[PDB]
């Protein structure tokens, strides 16, 4: 059934599973027409499909041409997501296919279920966690590959860089969700935190800076402070 704080360690067991987040699939800039009406212009989007145990990210880039001539795009985007996730599963060798797919938004359940009818043994699950994966486009290297795409494209990343050499996947996911929650609550401040010190660089083959274990504790503390501050600045506390 639904995934929540009670069964949270299930994410890091040895059953292959994927999170699917569809919040950046259908994106637009929304502007005024010469006549003074409002219009939208779609921009490139992406499906965020993540193995939380290994860090493997299947980033399917959604090029604006897929919306050309289509109606009811927010509804179509859910079915396009489900079509691309099903296509990804079919492309994986049998022993790499997931046993469970967890969707971050409940409106993806029926489209994914219908597209995965051929896979009756793969469970499609909602979650009650409010995961911050929408902020994936605040990661510079991910945003860059999405906006530069001229055609549909899949790009594979490890969203944990090399962290799993030194920490467990439970700890890596907790770090990732902290970073993304901060980028979602105040992107400018979070990015200042991550890059303030110019001696700490991002390897060419990485997404995040090359922090020592000690610097990660400082960084994580600065992110917690940011989130708590904003939550004060927000509710006045």
């Amino acid at each position: 059934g639904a995934m929540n704080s009670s069964n949270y360690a299930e994410l890091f067991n040895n059953d292959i599973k994927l999170f699917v987040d569809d919040t950046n699939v259908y994106r637009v800039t929304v502007h005024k027409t010469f006549e003074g009406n409002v219009a939208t212009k779609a921009i490139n989007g992406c499906i965020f499909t993540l193995n939380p145990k290994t860090g493997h990210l299947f980033l399917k880039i959604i090029h604006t041409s897929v919306w050309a001539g289509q109606k009811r795009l927010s509804q179509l985007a859910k079915w396009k997501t489900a079509e691309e996730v099903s296509a990804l599963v079919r492309s994986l060798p049998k022993e790499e296919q997931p046993k469970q797919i967890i969707v971050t938004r409940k409106a993806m359940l029926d489209p994914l279920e219908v597209h995965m009818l051929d896979f009756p043994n793969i469970a499609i699950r909602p979650t009650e966690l409010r995961l911050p994966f929408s902020a994936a486009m605040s990661i510079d290297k991910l945003s860059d590959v999405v906006m530069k795409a001229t055609e549909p494209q899949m790009v594979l990343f490890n969203i944990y860089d090399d962290w799993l050499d030194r920490i467990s996947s439970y700890t890596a996911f907790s770090r990732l969700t902290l970073l993304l929650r901060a980028l979602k609550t105040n992107e400018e401040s979070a990015k200042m935190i991550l890059l303030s010190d110019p001696t700490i660089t991002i390897k060419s083959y990485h997404l995040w800076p090359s922090f020592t274990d000690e610097q990660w504790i400082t960084i994580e503390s600065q992110m917690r402070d940011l989130i708590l501050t904003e939550y004060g600045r927000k509710y006045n506390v």
């Binding site: 029926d110 597209h115 051929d118």
Partner: protein
């Protein structure tokens, strides 16, 4: 006009004949029902005064044989039987009509309520949903489960309604996933009507039979089937115009006949609100929306 005689009435029971119901006292001199409308199927049904558990009854068509009821004290129910000796059955029924021991089926029906509830219902199709091939009549009760219920346990006692499942490979063409899920016309017209039922009359027959089993026996699987068959039509953008007009008449009479105090359990709020106000056919069921709004606005 035909007759369903009773050997006796040894236990106190409410007997219903189609939409009519009457009370028979324990060992009351009762020998059956006469003046039954030839040309319709009929249902004779029972609720014991002692144990309201298990409503049960029999679907029959008097053109297919001479049927009677006799109480079995071992199995504890009123059983329908067929008498093969015609000469004798007619002789006994005559005696009974002479002593005025039989109650009379009402003949006026301005409403035409029973024709309209059973317009498409045929005994031969009932007997394929309810498989007991040695009898010409079909037993149904409140507890019998459907084939679809059994896939999610005694096969001989099941209701073999046509399985309808909107998230199934039968319902969804590979490559038309979004199309077929949001517009069920393929599944209605090609799979079910052309493929399985052959025509809309057989579809409506099963829909009407499911409703009547839901209403008369409180059979939950039958209620599920009735609503599924409604929802499949309303959720199709492309439906023959004659079918929509006939569906509106069918449902109108079903909602008209449903006891007001059974609406909570026999009507599915989600299906009816979707069908009347959100579906492709939201504007095609004028008579049904009018009685639904007058009789049952709370559900909506």
């Amino acid at each position: 006009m035909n007759t369903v005689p009773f050997t006796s009435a040894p236990i106190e029971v409410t007997i219903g004949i189609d939409q009519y119901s009457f009370n028979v006292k324990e060992n009351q001199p009762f020998h059956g029902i006469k003046d039954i409308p030839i040309g319709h199927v009929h249902v004779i049904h029972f609720q014991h005064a002692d144990n309201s558990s298990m409503r049960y009854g029999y679907w029959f068509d008097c053109r297919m044989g001479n049927f009677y009821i006799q109480y079995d004290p071992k199995d504890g129910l009123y059983k329908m039987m067929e008498e093969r000796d015609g000469a004798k059955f007619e002789n006994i029924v005559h005696n009974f009509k002479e002593r005025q021991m039989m109650v009379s089926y009402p003949k006026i029906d301005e409403d035409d309520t029973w024709y309209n509830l059973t317009e498409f219902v045929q005994m031969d199709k009932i007997r394929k949903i309810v498989r007991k091939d040695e009898n010409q009549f079909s037993y149904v009760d409140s507890s019998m489960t459907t084939v679809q219920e059994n896939e999610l346990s005694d096969p001989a006692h099941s209701l073999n309604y046509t399985v309808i499942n909107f998230k199934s490979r039968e319902a969804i063409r590979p490559g038309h996933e979004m199309e077929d899920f949001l517009d069920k016309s393929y599944y209605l017209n090609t799979v079910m009507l052309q493929g399985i039922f052959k025509n809309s009359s057989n579809y409506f027959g099963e829909l009407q039979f499911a409703f009547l089993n839901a209403m008369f026996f409180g059979n939950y699987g039958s209620s599920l089937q009735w609503h599924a068959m409604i929802e499949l039509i309303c959720s199709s953008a492309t439906v023959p115009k004659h079918m929509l007009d006939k569906l509106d008449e069918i449902l109108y009479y079903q909602i008209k006949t449903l006891p007001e105090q059974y609406s909570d359990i026999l009507l599915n709020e989600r299906v009816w609100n979707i069908c009347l106000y959100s579906s492709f056919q939201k504007n095609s069921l004028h008579n049904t929306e009018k009685i639904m709004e007058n009789k049952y606005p709370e559900l909506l």
